[PDB]
Symmetry: C3
Subunit: 118 residues, 3 copies
């Protein structure tokens, strides 16, 4: 479950894990560079959930790597996508195209317990 706003996120099919995120403008990412691509997307998830921004098969096969990608439940800004080209060729993203996906997960990172020495 989640709420979201923005024009750079597209409605998904039920059988896909994630929503596609769409590139805002044409941009070239030279070999070995890192670019921070802005989106207008903002999400609200339920307690103990988080958003995970990760790669698509079509851009991963060209060497685009999405790094970072953990969207905490308390974040109220716009998602930024951190992209590094680890391929051997310049990558050109075209306005509009899918270039990452957002998956919503639940974590259990809470309720610390006593260590069992057993």
């Amino acid at each position: 479950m989640l709420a979201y706003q923005g024009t750079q996120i597209k409605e998904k099919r039920d059988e896909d894990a994630g929503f596609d995120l769409c590139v805002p403008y044409d941009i070239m990412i030279p070999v070995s560079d890192t670019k921070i691509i802005p989106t207008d997307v903002k999400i609200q998830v339920p307690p103990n959930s988080f958003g995970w921004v990760t790669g698509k098969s079509s851009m991963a096969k060209q060497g685009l790597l999405i790094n970072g990608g953990i969207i905490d439940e308390g974040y109220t800004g716009e998602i930024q996508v951190i992209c590094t080209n680890i391929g051997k060729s310049n990558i050109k993203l075209i306005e509009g195209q899918k270039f990452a996906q957002l998956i919503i997960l639940q974590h259990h990172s809470n309720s610390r317990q006593p260590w069992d020495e057993n």
Copy 2:
């Protein structure tokens, strides 16, 4: 829960998170290249679940990076493993060896809610 077929996936121990995926043939991956390694593995997961193909500690320590890796519930093909060498040395994979693992997760990417302006 899942169903699977193929000879390149190995049965796992209960206390490990993922199934090992096995390299189909000897292959060298030069510094900075990307190779798409085919498996014969096919999986069926329950609704709102997905498979996650990600790295092993022994190959990550040599600079092998598994990229992409999100196996949607609707996919009915064979898993492909997208590998990039981000290390400083050529990597040689040997026929049979483990080189990635498949973990089954549930996502909550569905049931869009109204935004709370609160």
Copy 3:
């Protein structure tokens, strides 16, 4: 839920997905190198759970990549963090600073089912 020990893990806020892991000593990571950074952190998670060591936004934006990162339920050692610099500049980590985060997830990688030919 989890138990943990060690001085290189910090208590978290409820609204963040993961615990920060803290660098043990000053260390420089040259462009394209890979370093294995030791922690003293040990965790115990419940059955069918795993720990996921992954990146922070502030270090991902400089080109630090955390690779591997899957901490199995049966592991009883100290977490090691595998770091590769995929940026274009040398990265300097300072003693004490956050440089990765640990998120606790549940997997469903178990209870193999019959394939449905339907």
